[PDB]
Amino acid sequence: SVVISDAWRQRFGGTARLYGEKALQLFADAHICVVGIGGVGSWAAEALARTGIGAITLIDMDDVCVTNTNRQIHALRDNVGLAKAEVMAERIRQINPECRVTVVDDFVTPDNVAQYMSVGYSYVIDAIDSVRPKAALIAYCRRNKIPLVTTGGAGGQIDPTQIQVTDLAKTIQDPLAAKLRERLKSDFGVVKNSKGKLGVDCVFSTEALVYPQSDGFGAATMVTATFGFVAVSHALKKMMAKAARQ
Amino acid sequence: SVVISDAWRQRFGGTARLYGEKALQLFADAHICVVGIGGVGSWAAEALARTGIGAITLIDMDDVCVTNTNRQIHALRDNVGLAKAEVMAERIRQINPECRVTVVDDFVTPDNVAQYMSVGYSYVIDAIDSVRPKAALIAYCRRNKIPLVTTGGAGGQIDPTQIQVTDLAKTIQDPLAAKLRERLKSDFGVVKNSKGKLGVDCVFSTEALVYPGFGAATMVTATFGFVAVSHALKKMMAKAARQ
Ligand SMILES: Nc1ncnc2c1ncn2[C@@H]1O[C@H](COP(=O)(O)O)[C@@H](O)[C@H]1O
Ligand SMILES: Nc1ncnc2c1ncn2[C@@H]1O[C@H](COP(=O)(O)O)[C@@H](O)[C@H]1O
Ligand SMILES: [K+]
Ligand SMILES: [K+]
Ligand code: NA
């Protein structure tokens, strides 16, 4: 449990006024895991910190690169070469000194996913950009009823107003989600039920993909960050709904 | 014109692969003004910097407050008490050391708007949260054909997926936009044309307001800023393509 300080109420008074006092405590007591701290995940982590989430785990083994500058909140001249997750953790500690931040300097694999998820998270935000670990994470959380929201590919898109949430089985214009569905089926026996759903919530966009315009898909902050923000809003909404139901 | 360095191409290669080389050059050559560096404007400024916009002016006179923490990108423990616009300017120089960043430590008034807009901006992003200077800024840019995107109320809302852009005359569920229309009409003679349009593009949300001095969330206020920036870039690219 987290005791909400007077400082915490100064930082997050606007949160309490928007979501309610019960939600402020719910968020303070929550532990959310963000897997992948890149074009989508770095903004998700920022949003969690700024909405009074009391414990955040960040999982990534990558370093900050100069080419991250177009789409990642931690990508600053002075951060290049440092571990992404550690850089983001330090920022979170500046946002909320009372937030409990854990860094896992690793990638999720079929072999370690149970270990890393054994912490008992309130929610998992899957912002992984490669299919093999993404499938392992999703299959595990789905099997174990761990609340999860995943994100499709956020590159090759310029319009943030077309971003929305649907079941993973129903995404369009998203090659990553399409590969992911194939891998879930072939490697984990995850297939859609009678209603044509996989039972996995996925942030995606109706926008037709914009192919590389210069000599891999490009990306923009305005879209990749909004993927991350929509994932966070979705998660908090589901957490509040569950709490109201119990 | 701006000569794009090797360093610039490394930072914004992803931008070039999304929008094209001509647009990369267009952005590098652009000068965009953000008025109000708060819950909406700070994220707009961030987005401009990370999309290779070559010159950015920031206008705000307020300081970073601890109560900004829920919704403003510059609100960090070590920044509290410093001028928002200078903090954001310093951050932009960390994003792109070659960006030409100007800080105007002031608020826009009917009396100073001409001076501050005479610079010749490629686009103005209006992220002011109070009606009187907001109307004055919009009236001036509209009269002078200065490209402008304005933002409605972003507080009291939890759903980023209902944010959109339309003409200011057609917004709904937005008390700030409604007040703004009234003040524009009464004080500046700005009224709807034959097609029912004011000729002002407005970012707003269809979401019904949530009453508790509204609360706010980063996920929504930042997305207002991002949508404003994407809208401006879309219009800039279209104009360049016409010509
Ligand atoms: N298996 C994994 N576990 C954790 N993070 C990952 C994994 N695979 C990829 N990521 C991260 O996801 C991010 C993708 O960002 P982007 O380049 O914007 O697609 C990068 O920071 C990667 O290091
Ligand atoms: N007349 C004005 N000119 C420039 N900036 C302003 C003006 N009025 C308000 N602002 C700023 O707009 C921001 C609004 O942010 P928020 O508190 O999230 O609504 C604050 O940083 C204000 O200081
Ligand atoms: K899409
Ligand atoms: K609204
Ligand atoms: Na939308």
Numbering used by the authors:
A (entry chain B): 2 to 216, 237 to 267
B (entry chain A): 2 to 213, 237 to 267
Question: What's in the article?
Answer:
The enzyme responsible for t6A cyclization in E. coli was identified by comparative genomic approaches and analysis of LC/MS data sets of genomic deletion strains (ribonucleotide analysis) as CsdL, subsequently renamed to TcdA, for tRNA threonylcarbamoyladenosine dehydratase A. TcdA is an ubiquitin-activating E1-like protein with detectable homology to the adenylyltransferases MoeB and ThiF. To further the understanding of ct6A biology we have determined the high-resolution crystal structures of CsdL/TcdA in complex with AMP and ATP, an E1-like activating enzyme from Escherichia coli, which catalyzes the ATP-dependent dehydration of t6A to form ct6A. CsdL/TcdA is a dimer whose structural integrity and dimer interface depend critically on strongly bound K+ and Na+ cations. The tertiary structure of monomeric TcdA consists of seven β-strands in a continuous sheet surrounded by eight α-helices.
To shed light onto the structural basis for the tRNA binding and ct6A synthetic properties of TcdA-ATP, we determined the crystal structure of E. coli TcdA loaded with ATP to 1.77 Å resolution (R/Rfree values of 0.139/0.176) and AMP to 1.89 Å resolution (R/Rfree values of 0.141/0.183). The structure of TcdA-AMP was solved by MR using the fully refined model of the TcdA-ATP complex. Besides localized changes in the active site, the TcdA-ATP and TcdA-AMP structures are identical (RMSD 0.16 Å over 246 Cα atoms). In the TcdA-AMP complex, the nucleotide-binding residues stabilize AMP in a manner analogous to ATP, with no conformational changes in the TcdA dimer. In the TcdA-ATP and TcdA-AMP complexes, the region between β7 and the C-terminal α8 spanning residues 214–236 is fully disordered in electron density maps. The first 310 helix (H310a) contains three residues that are conserved in the MoeB/E1 superfamily, including a strictly conserved Asn69 that interacts with bound ATP/AMP via water-mediated hydrogen bonds. In particular, the P loop and the residues that contact ATP/AMP are nearly strictly conserved across all structural homologs. A second metal binding site specific for Na+ is found at the dimer interface in an octahedral coordination. The Na+ cation is axially liganded by the carbonyl oxygens of two symmetric Thr162 residues that lie in a short 310 helix segment (H310c) from opposite monomers, with four water molecules occupying the equatorial positions.
